[PDB]
Amino acid sequence: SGSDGGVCPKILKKCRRDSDCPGACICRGNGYCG
């Protein structure tokens, strides 16, 4: 969850960018969605 886009459900989806993640998530500094 990046908070500014809303509450993300915070799935353990590994990523490379924010476009990998669902609606309100971001690609966090650990390489996963949040």
Total tally of structural domains belonging to the chain? 1
- Helices (H), ranges, 1-34: none
Question: What CATH code is carried by the domain that includes residue 33?
Answer: 4.10.75.20
Name the token pair of 11. Answer: 């799935």
Contact 17, 32 (CB under 8 A): no
Which among 12, 32, 34, 15 has a CA at the least distance from the CA of 23?
34
Backbone angles phi, psi at 3, to 5 degrees: 65, -45
Instruction: Look up the domain containing 27 and give its range.
Output: 1-34
